[PDB]
């Protein structure tokens, strides 16, 4: 029979030679098969396909190991979701806005833009080689693979409404934050004190208030007895912190933060904007850039720099 030589892969680094029957679909021979994101499972090999690399599902022990070592996941549908998203993100545009790689608007991708812009302003190293490799290229302007990966890891399809706080959570889970530590103390006038220690992702994220200073002074939270307890920051050790809260009018002053995310909309429909504090305040809305000395808007996430902090409260 007529045949061509193609290479299969799961990480696009380790190739596996294959002789394919041109009279059979790639699916009949390899299972679900993708070419640069396009699903060729039901397609038959072309002559132009000779020597090209195709993605396939891990169908043998060797591919299973290569897939995990690269992506750090054994979700059976991961590759399918990564390839489906890549077919869209590879068409997106990734301009350099104020020295940072952004994303031109498309398919409700605003949350990915501000997520990507935030990454380029905080110290963070990913663990999965897939994210390492893709993030390095996103920084250089080719973020199509990185975005497809963020969609795949976060179990989001192109066009789906996404949450920045949730998205950052997944990415931080795939990053080295083992050196991060946080100590809190909850004071209830009826139940006394109660210190708590957090590590890793839970050490750099808080949901309730946007102000890092107010976190140090104290924030009101419900106690089981019915009173309102006061939780404040005892000790922090991390290169950054993420403060989040439900969208609410909030003033971002120049020089008091690294960057933030604005959200306009509701739980079913909205748009994200990015605000970064450099020589002045810049608002990056995908490919759009505006500046101002003062900013006030519906802020939902604020990122601050950090190294080591210890409270003076006693
Ligand atoms: Zn109490």
What this model shows, in words?
- By secondary structure, this protein is α+β, with helices and mostly antiparallel strands.
- It has 3 domains: 2-56, no CATH class; 57-180, no CATH class; 181-311, no CATH class.
- It is 24% helix and 35% strand.
- The protein has helices at 26-30, 61-71, 78-89, 110-119, 129-140, 144-153, 164-173, 212-217, and strands spanning 3-9, 16-21, 33-35, 38-39, 53-56, 96-97, 100-101, 181-188, 192-199, 205-207, 219-222, 228-237, 240-252, 259-265, 270-277, 281-285, 288-292, 295-305, 308-310.
- Strands 10-13-18-14-15-16-17 form a 7-stranded mixed β-sheet, with helices on one face. It has a 5-stranded mixed β-sheet with strand order 2-1-5-3-4. Strands 8, 9, 11, 12 and 19 form a 5-stranded antiparallel β-sheet that branches.
- α3 (78-89) packs antiparallel against α6.
- The longest helix is centred in the N-terminal third of the chain and has 12 residues, at 78-89.
- It is elongated, with a radius of gyration of 23 Å.
- The N and C termini lie far apart (82 Å).
- It binds zinc ion.
- Zinc ion (ZN) binds next to loops.
- Residues 188, 190-191, 223, 225, 227, 229 line the site of zinc ion.
- Zn(2+) 6 binds at residues 188, 191, 223, 225.
- Residues 1-56 form the Ubiquitin-like domain.
- Residues 70-314 form the Peptidase C16 domain.
